[PDB]
């Protein structure tokens, strides 16, 4: 059936549309990490200038940062203890951001425990966190390991607000009243056209509906597909088509009332 196939192709089309800017943001952190891996100039002020320029030239970013292991940037952490942009370790951990409006540089917090630093350190791979809120801002973080001498020295990262995802996805309309939304890898809503309190707060895995649990399981694995869900209350049936977003195995979901696709 052609209506189903068109729906599958449309869900994939949108998934790749969303993936494109994600691949760009991933490349910005990765290119910064490769560059820092070679930076023997070991100049903290200049490196702070570099991540500030990257933030200013990329309005889709809200933070750009570097985070280093002890003495791994310049062997001189002891000369920067509680300096501007630094915490009591002296580690080079500048977080150049506009989370609160103006551009400021302050030290990263929780780098010893949080996924944005710990996952690239443990996996040695470019990482995309699940979405989260930070000081009021819904976002994900792309982080790439800096390898110097063959060894993990730190990370380069960018933080990406996700309000735009709701702005774009919650405007899609298909057939008569079909709609769309995006989810993260663990099935957390990045958008919803009417339930704004679910954004960043509820997962597909939270629904007591066998089919939705199954879609969520496919999404976690980066698998595309569709499920049919009959509502015992309205009798009405919808098909949820979900297609993977290559970067992070997020997923784009189109929800189509079945009668409308048969109409």
Structural domain containing residue 78: 24-161
> Do 239 and 142 fall into the same domain?
no
Q: Are 215 and 146 in contact (CB under 8 A)?
A: no
> Do 185 and 107 fall into the same domain?
no
Which of 134, 148, 117, 102 minimizes the C-alpha distance to 29?
117
CA 129, CA 151: separation in Å to the nearest integer? 22
Identify the bridge partners of residue 141 per DSSP, sorted by sequence position: 159
- Angle CA(175)–CA(17)–CA(145) in degrees, nearest 5? 145
CA 153, CA 76: separation in Å to the nearest integer? 14
Q: Are 95 and 105 in contact (CB under 8 A)?
A: yes
- Angle CA(162)–CA(18)–CA(262) in degrees, nearest 5? 115
- Angle CA(119)–CA(121)–CA(124) in degrees, nearest 5? 90
> Do 13 and 107 fall into the same domain?
no
For the record, the structure tokens of 137 come out as 């801002």
> Do 4 and 96 fall into the same domain?
no
Could you give the number of structural domains in the chain?
2
Q: Which of 101, 130, 161 is the last residue of a domain?
A: 161
Handedness of CA 56, 62, 64, 70 (dihedral sign): positive
Which of 217, 241, 206, 212 minimizes the C-alpha distance to 229?
212
> Do 174 and 138 fall into the same domain?
no
Q: Are strands 151-161 and 179-183 parallel, antiparallel or unpaired?
A: unpaired
- In a 10 Å sphere around its CB, with 0-12 CB exposed, 13-18 middle and 19+ buried, how is residue 262 labelled? exposed
> Do 31 and 78 fall into the same domain?
yes
Q: Which of 138, 161, 184 is the last residue of a domain?
A: 161
CA 63, CA 139: separation in Å to the nearest integer? 10
CATH code for position 213: 3.30.450.20
Given resolution (angstroms): 1.8
Q: Are 166 and 179 in contact (CB under 8 A)?
A: no
Q: Are 162 and 52 in contact (CB under 8 A)?
A: no
Identify the bridge partners of residue 94 per DSSP, sorted by sequence position: 107
Q: Are 155 and 120 in contact (CB under 8 A)?
A: yes
Q: Which of 161, 180, 214 is the last residue of a domain?
A: 161
> Do 133 and 256 fall into the same domain?
no
> Do 211 and 130 fall into the same domain?
no
Which of 229, 262, 260, 227 minimizes the C-alpha distance to 242?
227
> Do 13 and 36 fall into the same domain?
no
The SS3 assignment for 169 reads helix
For the record, the structure tokens of 165 come out as 């995802």
> Do 94 and 172 fall into the same domain?
no
Q: Are 44 and 74 in contact (CB under 8 A)?
A: yes
Method: X-ray
Long-range CB contact pairs, 120-129, < 8 A, 24+: 120/144, 120/145, 120/152, 120/155, 121/145, 121/152, 121/155, 124/152, 126/26, 126/29, 126/30, 128/22, 128/26, 128/247, 128/248
Q: Are 87 and 55 in contact (CB under 8 A)?
A: no
> Do 221 and 129 fall into the same domain?
no
> Do 37 and 140 fall into the same domain?
yes
Q: Within 10 Å of residue 20's Cβ, how many Cβ atoms? A: 11
Handedness of CA 79, 84, 85, 88 (dihedral sign): positive
């Amino acid at each position: 059936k052609l209506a189903y196939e068109k729906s599958i192709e449309m869900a994939g089309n949108y998934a790749n549309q969303f993936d494109a800017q994600m691949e760009a943001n991933q490349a910005i952190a990765r290119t910064l990490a490769c560059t820092m891996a070679e930076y023997g100039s070991q100049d903290r002020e200049e490196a702070m200038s570099i991540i500030k320029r990257i933030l200013n030239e990329n309005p889709q970013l809200i933070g750009v940062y570097l985070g280093y292991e002890p003495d791994a940037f310049d062997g001189r952490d002891k000369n920067y203890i509680n300096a501007p942009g630094h915490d009591s370790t002296g580690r080079f951990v500048p977080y150049c951001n506009k989370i609160n409006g103006p551009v400021i540089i302050e030290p990263l917090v929780h780098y010893d425990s949080s996924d944005y630093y710990q996952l690239p350190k443990t996996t040695g791979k470019d990482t995309l966190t699940e979405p989260y809120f930070y000081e009021g801002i819904f976002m994900v973080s792309y982080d790439s390991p800096i390898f110097k001498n063959g060894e993990f020295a730190g990370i380069a990262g960018v933080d990406v607000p996700l309000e735009y995802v709701d702005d774009v996805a919650s405007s899609i309309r298909t057939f008569d009243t079909g709609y769309a939304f995006m989810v993260s890898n663990t099935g957390i809503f990045l958008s919803h056209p009417t339930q704004k309190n679910w954004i960043g707060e509820k997962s597909l895995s939270d629904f007591d509906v066998e089919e939705i649990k199954n879609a969520a399981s496919d999404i976690r694995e980066g698998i595309g597909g569709h499920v049919e869900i009959k509502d015992p209350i309205t009798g009405k049936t919808v098909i949820m088509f979900y297609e993977p977003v290559k970067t992070g195995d997020f997923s784009f979901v189109l929800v189509v009332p079945k009668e409308e696709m048969l109409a």
